[PDB]
């Protein structure tokens with residue numbers, strides 16, 4: 001049921017084939033920063049260009065993902081019988097160079113651009129959020145045992 | 159108004175003369191990691207060995223700090239007419255090797271040992287929380303402009 005490296009690569013291929021700018025986030029994002037798989041994963045988190053929201057959802061449905069949680073335009077969780085869980089997060093990629101997310105209520109989060117980057121993982125280049133961003137969006141007073149493991153793995157990155 | 163480097167050192171000295179294990183935290187903790195002062199600070203945050211809570215409070219009171227809000231177990235917020243604001247956070251250095259802080263809603267927060275570090279600041283060794291711990295206890299979705307400034311100062315750390 002867990003999301004294997006091969007299944008992650010397939011999802012990465014989907015977005016790249018669709019020419020949708022995106023970055024891997026969450027737990028697989030942590031492992032990718034370390035250069036190898038560290039643990040089993042329930043899910044993949046992908047942050048993606050919000051202008052392609054409709055065709056991203058449609059393609060995921062087309063290959064068998066079922067929508068289970070729809071918190072859009074903030075977040076959506078889908079589930080595939082083989083590929084596992086996938087959470088997508090639409091983000092706004094503005095012509096003025098800025099990268100934003102709508103504030104669930106009022107306003108816009110303005111991300112730091114260098115929080116979105118790329119790493120060479122087993123000689124594939126994978127766009128992903130940075131180690132710094134991973135630590136920033138983790139919450140120190142709200143950590144699971146698995147969060148603790150991931151944070152230690154980030155620390156081991158030279 | 160603020161808390162100067164000289165004032166900071168004197169508060170650090172109090173803990174050292176009391177022989178209480180402690181770590182500098184908060185904004186001054188960020189500056190110390192970088193090795194020089196970066197901005198004016200309204201307060202000091204110090205995490206310290208909870209076994210010494212009673213004598214630590216007594217000494218702060220003896221030199222003239224007044225308790226503003228008593229939030230045990232999390233912390234005590236204090237204020238001094240000349241030295242300004244000081245928050246202290248009692249942490250438990252357990253014989254099982256864990257480091258924890260009580261959570262008023264049940265259980266405890268678990269910290270990692272390597273979040274408690276030190277650095278050479280102007281040829282003084284100051285114990286302080288780590289760079290990664292500072293990022294971790296910041297909240298990505300709730301950063302002020304000063305938080306961003308503080309965080310970028312940690313980038314610059316070669």
Ligand SMILES: CCC[C@@H]1C[C@@H](C(=O)N[C@@H]([C@H]2O[C@H](SC)[C@H](O)[C@@H](O)[C@H]2O)[C@@H](C)O)N(C)C1
Nearest residue numbers: 025045047075087089111115116129133137138
């Ligand atoms: C540099 C930008 C990083 C941002 C962080 C990411 C995000 O929102 N993650 C959520 C996650 O909450 C839970 S994990 C605890 C969810 O399980 C997970 O799917 C996911 O939503 C939370 C940690 O902030 N954002 C879109 C972009």
Ligand SMILES: CCC[C@@H]1C[C@@H](C(=O)N[C@@H]([C@H]2O[C@H](SC)[C@H](O)[C@@H](O)[C@H]2O)[C@@H](C)O)N(C)C1
Nearest residue numbers: 183184185203205247269273287291292295296
């Ligand atoms: C390493 C584990 C120890 C815990 C971590 C620490 C913590 O939360 N510090 C925050 C502080 O952010 C602001 S200061 C800039 C807050 O004002 C301050 O209260 C304070 O939370 C960190 C970002 O500097 N805790 C009390 C104990």
Ligand SMILES: [Cl-]
Nearest residue numbers: 269270271272
């Ligand atoms: Cl630990």
Ligand SMILES: [Mg+2]
Nearest residue numbers: 026027043045
């Ligand atoms: Mg994930």
Ligand SMILES: [Mg+2]
Nearest residue numbers: 026043045087
């Ligand atoms: Mg997730």
Ligand SMILES: [Mg+2]
Nearest residue numbers: 184185201203
């Ligand atoms: Mg502070």
Ligand SMILES: [Mg+2]
Nearest residue numbers: 184185201203
């Ligand atoms: Mg503070």
